[PDB]
Structure formats: C-alpha cells, structure tokens
Symmetry: C3
Subunit: 330 residues, 3 copies
C-alpha cells in the first residue's frame, strides 16, 4: 500500500502546484496588458553664479533644463564653461589640435579629426608660450581644460523635480496618473519623495534621486552623469484602481575609470550686436535623467481561466500516467 | 460503443483545436519579429494673437512646436503667458513666495521650495496692496495667475500634423512607411485622416486627433494636455507587403480633478539690447503628443512549423492516453 | 527486437533534445533580464558654407545637431535653406498658396490648409511675373523650391559621432558601458568604428554609418534621411562581464518614390535689431539618427534549472508512453 500512498501524495502535490502556483500565484486566470505612458517633468529651484567675467548670473528652470519642454530624457545643468561673444573670424586654434613653431607646420584646410576651423596655413600665437595653427572659425576658441570645481550649479542638489506620469492600459481602458488619489494639493505643497516615508510624492529632490541611484551629487555635478528613473505599474485590475500605484527605482553608476566618465554637451546662444552676429558658447555639464515607464495590468478573463484549467488537467493526467508507469517498473 | 464514439469525438475536437487554433489562427507555422521605427512630424497651420502689450503676433510652425526638429514626443503650444524684457536685477518677489509687512519678515537667501531669486532681506511692494520679499533674479517676476481664456492658440485645432513613420522588420529585411502605396501626392495635397473614411492619410487635424482621444480641444488648449498616438504594424509577411498597413489609435484622458490637470513648461528667448542681456519668458501651455510605434511581422518558417507539428502530436497523444485512462475508470 | 531498438533510439533522441537544445542551447537553466539604457551622443567635425547673401559661415557641433544636448533620436544638419531677417508684416504670399490676378481673387483670412499668413484681401506681386495674395506674417516668405545641390553640409560625411551607451541589467545589478575594457584613451584618440576591423570603437564616421545602412550620403545629404542605429547587449552573465559587449547594426532605406523621401524641419533664430524683432528662418535638411538599445542578460538560477528539469522529465515520460502506445497498435 506504500506505492498507493505515494501515488496520492504525488497526485496532490501536482494539484497543489497547479492551483496555488499556476492559477493563484502566476494568476493564470488573468489576461495581461502593457501600458502606454506619457511623462512630463517640471524642475524648480534656483542657482546663482558669480563668474569673474560677468556679475551675478541667475539660473532658473528655463535655463538649466534641456530640453525646456521636458522629455523622458532631460538634462539638468550642474556645471558649465562659457565662451562669450564668439564671432566668426581668424584666431589661434586650440593647442589640442596641434602645436607648431613655423608657418610650415600648418596645412591649410581641416583636420581629419575634431576640426576646430579652417586652417589658413599660418602659425600664430595661442598664448605667450604656445603657437598653434591659425584657423577660421568661432573666435576666440573655447578653452575647457579647467572644469569649474566646485560645480557652478552644485545647488541643483536642492532642485525639486516634479514627475507627472500618465499611463493607459489600452486593452482594459484604464487610465492612471502617478498623482494617485492619496496625493492632494497639500501634499504637492510640501512633500518630498522618500523611498519608504513618502513613496507616492511625485516631487523629487535631485540630490536625493542621485543618492538613491548610488552616486554622489558632488562628483556628478562637476563633470555630469546619468541617473535612470524607472516607474513601474504592476497593477491587478481585479482590485480597485486606487491600488494601481507606481513604484520608483533609481539607477546609475559613476566610476573613476576616467574614460568619458561624466556627461557634457555644447550649445550656443546666438545674438546680434552692433550689426555683427555673435554667439555665447556653453559647454554644459549636467545630469541626464532618463525616465523609463513600464508596467503590466492583469484582469480576470474567462478564456485564460479555461486555458489554465485545461493545462492543469493535462499536467494532472500526464503525472498520473507516468506514476502508473514508474510504479509498474518498481 | 457509446464510450468509443466519445473517444473519437474527443480525438477530433483535439485535432480541430490543434490545427484550426494553434496552426491556423495563432499562426504557429510563422516566425515572428518586432520592428524598429522612426517617426518624423511636420506641423502646418498658423495662429495670430493680439496681446495688449504688443501688436499682432504670428505663430507658425517654427514657434509653436517643441522641439522644432520634432520627436516621438512633441508639444504644440495652445496657450501662453509671456513676461517680456526680463533682466537680472532686484524686484519684488511674487506673493506666492510669501507676503511680508516689515523687512524683518524676509530672510536673505533662497527659499527651501520654489525659490524665485536670492532674497535680500528687504520687504518691498509687489503692487499697491501687497508687499513681498525683494529678490535678485529675473525681473519683473512672471505673473501667471490668469491663464488666457479662450486659449491664445486655440486655432491650433485646425493645425494639420503630418506623421512620417518609417519602420523596419530587421529579421525579415522588410521596410515599410506609413505613406503606403495607396497614398499618393494627390492625397497628400488634400487628405485629412478619418478613422473610417480615410484611415491611411498621414495628415491629421489636431482637433480631430484630440476628439478621437476622448478629449475636448477647447479644454485642452487653455491649460494643456496629453494625446497619445499609437501606430501599430500587425503584418503577415506571407502576403504582399502592400497589405502591411499601419493602424492609428488615439489615447488621452482629461479630468477636472484640478490637481495638475494640464501641461505647461517655461522657456526663455535671450537677446541683447542696448548692451544689456534680456530674455522673454514664456509659460507655454500645450498638448504633448506622444507617438508610440509597435508592431509584429510574421512570416512562414519551417522550424516553427515542425515545432508546432510536434506540439500538436504531443497534445493528441496525451489526450488519447488520458481518454483511455478515463474510460478504464468509467 | 526491432521495435525495442526503435523505442531506445526515440528515448535517446528525446533525451538529446531535452538536454542539448532546451538546457544547453536555449539555456533553460538561466533566468533572463532586460536592460535599461542611456545614450549620449557627441558630434565632432566642422563645415563651412559660402552663401551669396553672407560670407563664410562656420557650422560646428552646437549649430548642426538637433537637439544640442543630444537624445536617442537626433538630427545632423546636412543641407539648409535660410530666410534671413524675417519680420512680421505685410508681404506677397508664396505662390504655392495660390496665384491671383485681381484683388477679388483673394479672401481675407487664413487658408484651410498650409496657411502662410492672414490674407488681407489684396492681390500683390510676388515677383515680376506672379501675383499672389497679400498676407500678414513673417516677411519675406520663405522660398524653398531650390534645395541646394550639392548639399551645403555634405562635409558632415566626415563628421564623427561618439556614442556613449550606459546600460543596466537591474535584476542582476550589472552595469555596462559600450566603452568596454578593450577601449582605452589611445583608441578614443584615433579609432573609427568598422563592422569587422574595429567593432568596439564608439566613434562612428557619419558617412560610414550611412553606407552601412545601405544608403548613399550624397543622396541623404541634399534632402535628409533616417539612419537607425541599434545597440544590442546579448550577454551571458555566467561568464565574466568583460564578454558583455555591444553589437552595432545600422538600418535605413532611401527610395526615389519622391513622396516625402527625405527629412526636413523648420526652426527660427529670434533676435532684436534697431528695436524691432526679427528672426532667421531655417529649413534644415538632415539625417535623423535613431539609436535603439535592446539586450538580454542571462544568469544561471536554480529555479529555472529545476523547472527545465521537470519539463524535460515530462517530455521524456510523454514520449515513452506514446511510443508504448504506437508499438501496441503496430
Ligand atoms: C598656454 O597654453 C598652453 C596650452 O594650453 C598651456 O600649457 C598647458 O598648461 C596646463 C596647465 O598647467 C597643462 O595641464 C597639466 O599638464 C600636466 C602635465 O604637464 C598634467 O599633469 C596636469 O594634470 C594638467 O593636465 C597642460 O599640459 C599644458 N600644455 C602643454 C602643451 O604644455 C600654458 O600653461 C599656457 N600658458 C599660459 C601663460 O597660460
Ligand atoms: C496685488 O497682488 C495680489 C497678489 O497677487 C492680488 O491679490 C490676489 O488677487 C487675485 C485676483 O482677485 C486672487 O485670486 C482669487 O482669490 C480668490 C480667493 O480670495 C479665489 O476664490 C479666486 O478663484 C482667485 O484665486 C488672489 O487670491 C489674491 N491674493 C491675495 C494674497 O489676496 C491683488 O489683487 C493685487 N492688487 C492689484 C491692485 O492688482
Ligand atoms: C516668379 O515666381 C514663380 C512662382 O514661384 C516662378 O515660376 C516657377 O518657376 C519654377 C522654376 O522655373 C518652376 O519650377 C519648375 O516647373 C517645371 C514645370 O513648369 C517643372 O518641370 C520643374 O521641375 C520645376 O518644378 C515653377 O513651376 C514655376 N511656377 C509657376 C507657377 O509657373 C517664376 O519663375 C518666378 N519669376 C522670376 C522672375 O523669378
Ligand atoms: N564625436 C567625436 N569624435 C571624436 N572624438 C570625440 C568625439 N566625442 C568625443 N571625442 C573625444 O573623446 C574624448 C572623451 O570624450 P568626452 O566628450 O567625454 O571628453 P571631453 O573632454 O568633454 O571631450 P571634448 O572636450 O573634446 O568635447 C575627448 O578627448 C573627446 O575629444
Ligand atoms: N518641481 C517642482 N517642485 C515643487 N513644486 C512643484 C514642481 N513642479 C510643480 N510644482 C507645484 O505643483 C503644483 C501643480 O503643478 P503645475 O505645474 O501643474 O501647476 P502650475 O501652476 O503650472 O505650477 P507653477 O506655476 O508653479 O509652475 C504648483 O503649485 C507647482 O508650484
Ligand atoms: N502638417 C502638414 N499638413 C499638410 N500638408 C503637409 C504637412 N506636412 C507636409 N505637408 C505637405 O506634404 C508634402 C510633402 O511633405 P514634405 O514635408 O516632405 O515636403 P516639403 O516640400 O518639405 O513640405 P513643405 O515645404 O510644404 O514644408 C508637401 O507638399 C507638404 O506641403
Ligand atoms: C541644500 O539644502 C540643504 C538644506 O538646506 C543645505 O544644508 C545646509 O547647509 C548649511 C551650510 O552648511 C547649514 O548651515 C544648514 O544647517 C544645512 N541644512 C541642513 C538641513 O542640513 C545644503 O547646503 C544645500 N546645498 C546645496 C548644494 O544646494
Ligand atoms: C477651425 O476650422 C473650422 C472650419 O473652417 C471653423 O469652423 C467655422 O467657424 C466659422 C465661425 O463660426 C463658421 O462661419 C464656419 O461655417 C465654420 N466652418 C465649418 C465647416 O464648420 C472653426 O471656427 C476653426 N476654429 C479654430 C479654433 O481654428
Ligand atoms: C571626407 O574625407 C575624405 C578623406 O579625407 C575626403 O576624400 C579626399 O578627397 C580629396 C578630394 O577629392 C582627395 O584628394 C583625397 O585623396 C581624398 N582622401 C581619401 C582618403 O580618399 C572626402 O573628400 C571628404 N569629403 C567630405 C564630403 O567631407
Ligand atoms: C561626495 O564626495 C566627497 C569627497 O569627494 C565627500 O566629502 C562627500 O561627503 C560625498 N557626498 C556624499 C553624499 O557621500
Ligand atoms: C468643449 O466644451 C465646451 C464647454 O466647456 C462646449 O461648449 C464645447 O462644445 C466642447 N467641445 C466639444 C468638441 O465637445
Ligand atoms: C552616390 O550617388 C552618386 C550618383 O548620384 C554616385 O556618383 C556616388 O558614387 C554615390 N556614392 C556612393 C557612396 O555610392
Ligand atoms: Mg575639451
Ligand atoms: Mg504659477
Ligand atoms: Mg516648400
């Protein structure tokens, strides 16, 4: 009778699996659906800089967010080098293009790599001790060898980021916003997001977001960096929608490998003064924030329920037949 | 013989499932592939505004599309508040930062939240009846309490959006454009997209796109909003490519919850006048259009066909054995 | 005994499949994970243009990359038409809006499609032989009928694109950059990517990228185009991370169908001169580069290993029972 006792145990273990795991845990009675998301970001916070060339400079949201309209990926400026009042003309090329001593060491034209301008074939003086090729281009050339340290916009640590995420589960016609029912105006007036204390506030302090990605804002501010923000919507639509909540994770890794460690870009502000076209060239160091929204909604459906029941019946039958096979041999 | 009759029915029902559903409907004879897509958008249409501060202002595509080069996510401006000729200096801070009565009610420095400038510790007059902290910043401060109603660019309803979607099924080396063979120059000259009448015209009226997402353009224009546009490519590559067509759906939900209901951003136009740097500050209300392109191409392949045949043979055999088991007990 | 010999062969063939394919090839012992990616791009290279209206014009990275901060999708300008010093006023509308002969042929207001301005009801002269509606708008109207050929920025072929891709496998806590251990500073100083010679250099020549997508840079430069760049991370995390490498593919199809073949957009540079607001209107033809990053990391896990073992046991048992069934009938 011991073989018969084993038969029953195996039959029940199989039934316990088929129900508890496949039907209940894995939710085999549910049809699944992905989402389509929209993310809007608003930055708040102010930075002031005191350069030697200029006076106090105010940096508000319109000036330190790239793009201004926002996106899933956006940059907050944390440092910059500015080359003001650049004009198109002839100047000494930056020594990174090459250092010459005579006019014969310059070839007219463009460098094969990282050309700064059209070489005129003339070796002119970059400074009092270095002579470089004369070029036609934006003059004076940018000198970005000294990255400002501490970062010019290191006050961006206290900037607040408001993420407005609108998601739709199109199959189930369910619309959710990360501004969930628990979020009200009083919360939006004072709340700052906290992984455990305030996991639903959609206003994030930038320094907290960088800290939670495992990075140091002081290091990321000087040369730039990347913080990934994931918003996950794992919703069981058999329950009320008020349980369909977003989960926030922050990702990032800054290493001292010193091979392109940070993030920077160059942009220019063009203007006309005294009838001549000028530009301000900025090398902008900043943290790029990538906001990735994924999710999965499940709702009970009859067709998955029957299909799962059929699969469980098949699993149960195969098990019984193989056990009758194994016992025949034993 | 009734048991034998049932045996045959169950055997055939199983065969009917294995062929008709798994092989034919679910297309188990096909290998599947996702796509890689590119979306370009061109807006057309003009808006004119008549502000009290300025004269008639023309708003063409270069000015109301953010970004100008386009993207999967782009904003069309439908309303704005403009603060012209802002300069960096000292002014009264906006009363939203706090209302003071004496110089002692102001602390020099920055507010912890939503700082507008560097407080100087002086309580100056915002208007004839309100006194606020004096700040260093962009002056005069923006006053965006009165959103223009009706929307300044409510004529954007008649703007036309041209979506050019290029998709590739890299596994099958198949390239498709949403400008399908049925779309010609004569169509692009006059066609407007219609869910049923013109489901292939790639020129969309903005108001129609908002209406089809379930929203009201008049409401979305004043404070902004979001419309999701999905392009789906469900193509059976056993047929001619001319049947590989895109399907357009429009998604969106505007609610009167009054907690961040619309969409807005701030951007600045910088300029130099009389040797002093100025900026025009715009608070731009607009509809963000997210274009999501997904799809799936199937082509007959021999390996899925054999694997499906093996799976069907297994299903048929398991069924017969379990039926011989059930009949043994019956 | 021949039937018994077949039984064993089928049993072993089944075991060979269950191990070699399912366990070893398909890696059924591994748990899988997707990635979250961040892409930053830096363009380098210079172009000079010699228009008849202006002098030599220098085009560096800040001016020919849209957006300047970069994105997954970005545009490199390869051609442009410029309408300088546009002001809001009254001018002759472009003849594409319609050609009139009398003032009665113009209706005040806006065109239903592709409106260029507010018609005043007056038929004025566009040129010495064409009369069009007078409009209020940006004047003079852009004339983009003659696309510059050869392309004004056809030197963009030699521009170099640096892709910095940071990916994370969040389930396995593995961070990878496309600047893999084999890439050093000496490589970044001189390397250009090559499908087979230098498959790991993250600096791409634009012309090479277009050639590898199957397109001609000369054709794409005049009217614009699209090149898709895919970065794939198919990593087996049972091995060292130094084997987690990116694979680059380039996608694109340019056809002479002449129905919206290229890519272009319009953007404006606004400025103030002599107390009047002006703008430079650019119609920018360029190649849009879409960078798509996908990947899959597998690491050995005990739960998939046991589940695969159970599936293989089930497959083996079903096979033996059906073979005993087939042999009973034979
Ligand atoms: C004139 O221009 C040249 C070139 O820009 C200047 O020389 C450069 O000066 C910087 C700062 O001292 C040097 O950077 C440092 O170099 C050492 C190695 O020598 C390195 O250990 C440091 O980490 C740092 O990178 C740079 O190498 C040097 N370049 C050359 C070609 O010597 C020069 O100082 C300028 N003169 C004046 C009057 O400003
Ligand atoms: C000087 O500045 C102050 C502050 O901006 C102005 O007071 C504000 O005026 C607006 C318009 O009347 C008020 O908005 C309305 O408030 C009521 C509640 O009182 C609300 O029901 C309406 O929906 C609307 O929001 C605003 O509350 C009020 N602020 C304060 C602090 O009283 C004032 O009118 C300005 N004076 C001049 C001469 O313009
Ligand atoms: C004044 O303006 C009108 C309208 O812009 C100019 O007429 C246009 O001239 C262009 C160039 O010759 C024509 O383009 C060509 O048309 C032929 C067909 O006629 C076509 O085969 C070519 O591929 C090309 O597209 C354009 O059709 C023509 N438009 C009209 C309405 O006739 C005119 O030349 C201008 N006059 C001066 C003095 O510049
Ligand atoms: N598109 C490109 N083509 C060639 N070299 C590039 C390109 N982008 C970056 N580099 C080079 O790669 C190295 C590291 O890149 P990175 O941009 O992070 O440093 P960087 O100092 O900010 O670069 P740079 O000052 O030259 O813009 C630099 O020496 C830079 O010149
Ligand atoms: N990054 C942020 N940090 C703190 N508060 C924010 C942030 N973004 C928005 N808010 C606040 O959230 C509330 C609602 O946001 P929303 O931007 O939709 O309204 P708003 O009136 O346009 O905001 P505002 O005028 O202050 O830019 C506003 O009171 C706004 O001040
Ligand atoms: N949003 C839109 N609404 C209506 N027509 C459009 C729109 N976008 C493009 N078109 C028209 O489609 C045709 C082909 O589009 P495409 O932009 O590629 O050519 P184009 O010459 O650059 O267009 P255009 O010069 O008018 O901007 C053009 O005649 C253009 O006028
Ligand atoms: C960001 O904000 C915090 C909080 O206001 C600042 O921390 C303060 O620093 C000053 C100067 O050291 C101290 O006197 C305060 O006591 C600190 N406050 C707290 C609560 O710790 C911080 O300096 C700010 N920094 C930046 C870069 O913006
Ligand atoms: C968008 O276009 C439609 C169609 O031209 C405009 O509807 C017209 O409105 C005027 C004024 O009420 C009527 O005289 C016309 O008969 C309407 N035409 C049609 C076909 O209904 C509409 O006003 C425009 N609105 C915006 C905001 O652009
Ligand atoms: C891009 O760079 C290549 C390489 O420098 C250029 O090819 C050169 O063209 C000139 C003029 O015909 C020849 O004298 C050189 O011998 C060529 N070099 C090589 C290695 O082939 C090319 O012209 C450049 N073009 C653009 C559009 O930038
Ligand atoms: C960042 O690094 C500096 C040293 O470079 C250290 O003093 C500081 O405390 C760090 N900040 C954090 C948040 O760890
Ligand atoms: C939008 O709402 C207004 C009332 O606020 C209504 O008069 C108008 O008809 C609505 N438009 C549409 C398209 O339903
Ligand atoms: C591009 O096309 C032109 C002809 O239009 C041809 O001369 C040239 O060689 C082509 N370039 C490449 C890279 O094939
Ligand atoms: Mg540098
Ligand atoms: Mg406000
Ligand atoms: Mg045109």
């Amino acid at each position: 009778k011991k073989v018969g006792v084993i038969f029953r145990l195996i039959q029940l273990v199989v039934l316990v699996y088929v129900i508890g795991w496949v039907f209940l845990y894995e939710k085999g009675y549910q049809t699944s659906s992905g989402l389509i998301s929209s993310v809007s970001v608003k930055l708040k916070g102010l930075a002031v800089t005191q350069l030697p060339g200029l006076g106090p400079q105010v940096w508000d949201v319109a000036d330190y967010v790239f793009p201004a309209q926002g996106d899933n990926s956006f940059v907050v400026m944390t440092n910059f080098i500015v080359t003001p009042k650049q004009t198109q003309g002839y100047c000494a090329e930056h020594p990174e293009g090459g250092i010459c001593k005579e006019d014969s060491g310059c070839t007219p034209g463009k460098a094969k790599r990282k050309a700064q301008g059209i070489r005129t074939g003339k070796c002119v003086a970059f400074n009092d001790t270095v002579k470089t090729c004369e070029i036609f281009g934006w003059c004076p050339v940018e000198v970005d060898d000294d990255i400002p340290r501490p970062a010019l916009l290191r006050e961006a640590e206290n900037f607040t980021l408001f993420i407005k995420n609108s998601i739709s589960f199109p199959r189930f016609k369910v619309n959710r916003r990360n501004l969930v029912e628990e979020v009200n105006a009083a919360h939006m007036k004072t709340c700052l997001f906290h992984k455990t204390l305030h996991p639903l506030c959609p206003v994030f302090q930038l320094g907290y977001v960088v800290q939670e990605s495992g990075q140091n804002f002081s290091t990321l501010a000087e040369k730039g960096g990347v913080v990934g923000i994931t918003i996950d919507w794992h919703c069981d639509l058999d329950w009320h929608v008020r349980h369909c909540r977003p989960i926030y994770e922050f990702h990032g890794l800054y290493e001292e490998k010193n091979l392109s460690p940070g993030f920077n870009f160059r942009f220019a502000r063009h203007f006309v003064e005294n009838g001549t076209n000028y530009r301000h060239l900025f090398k902008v160091f900043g943290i790029r924030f990538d906001i990735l929204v994924d999710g999965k909604a499940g709702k009970f459906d009859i067709i998955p329920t029957m299909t799962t029941i059929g699969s469980g019946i098949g699993i149960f039958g195969v098990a019984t037949v193989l056990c009758d096979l194994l016992l025949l041999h034993i």
